[PDB]
Amino acid sequence: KPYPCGLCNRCFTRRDLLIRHAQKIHS
Ligand SMILES: [Zn+2]
């Protein structure tokens, strides 16, 4: 899989978790 977040300096596991991370913290 695929999922770097650009708001908090990161790399990742599930998709749904990145969506719930930005859609729960950033916007
Ligand atoms: Zn973040």
Residue numbers in the entry: 1 to 27
Q: Which text from the study accompanies this structure?
A:
Here, using a combination of cotranslational nascent chain force measurements, inter-subunit fluorescence resonance energy transfer studies on single translating ribosomes, molecular dynamics simulations, and cryoelectron microscopy, we show that a small zinc-finger domain protein can fold deep inside the vestibule of the ribosome exit tunnel. To explore the possibility of protein folding inside the exit tunnel, we chose the second of the two zinc-finger domains in the yeast ADR1 protein (Párraga et al., 1988). The domain (called ADR1a) is 29 residues long and folds around a Zn2+ ion using two histidines and two cysteines to chelate the ion. The folding of ADR1a is totally dependent on the presence of Zn2+ (Párraga et al., 1988) and can hence be easily manipulated (Conti et al., 2014).
To confirm that ADR1a folds inside the exit tunnel, we sought to visualize it in the ribosome at tether length L = Lmax (i.e., at the top of the fFL profile) by cryo-EM. Because, with the relatively weak SecM AP from E. coli, fFL ≈ 1 at L = Lmax, stably stalled ribosome-ADR1a-SecM complexes of this kind cannot be isolated. We therefore introduced the previously described strongly stalling SecM (Ms-Sup1) AP (Ismail et al., 2012) instead. Parts of the SecM AP can be seen in the exit tunnel, as well as the P-site tRNA. Strikingly, an extra density, not present in empty ribosomes, is clearly visible in the exit tunnel, ∼60 Å from the tRNA. The ADR1a domain is lodged between ribosomal proteins uL22 and uL23 and ribosomal rRNA helices H23, H24, and H50 and is located a few angstroms deeper in the exit tunnel in the cryo-EM reconstruction than in the ensemble of folded structures seen in the 140 K molecular dynamics trajectory (bottom, arrow). The ADR1a snapshot structure (gold) from the 140 K simulation ensemble that best fits the cryo-EM reconstruction (red) in the exit tunnel is shown in Figure 3C. Using this approach, we show that the small zinc-finger domain ADR1a folds cotranslationally as the tether connecting it to the ribosome grows in length from ∼20 to ∼30 residues. Both coarse-grained molecular dynamics simulation and cryo-EM visualization of ribosome-bound ADR1a at a tether length corresponding to the midpoint of the folding transition show ADR1a buried deep in the vestibule of the exit tunnel, providing a clear demonstration that small proteins or protein domains can fold within the ribosome, as predicted by computational studies (O’Brien et al., 2010, 2011). We conclude that ribosomal stalling on the SecM AP is prevented when ADR1a folds and that, as it takes about 30 residues of extended nascent chain to span the ∼100 Å from the P-site to the tunnel exit (Bhushan et al., 2011), ADR1a folds inside the exit tunnel.
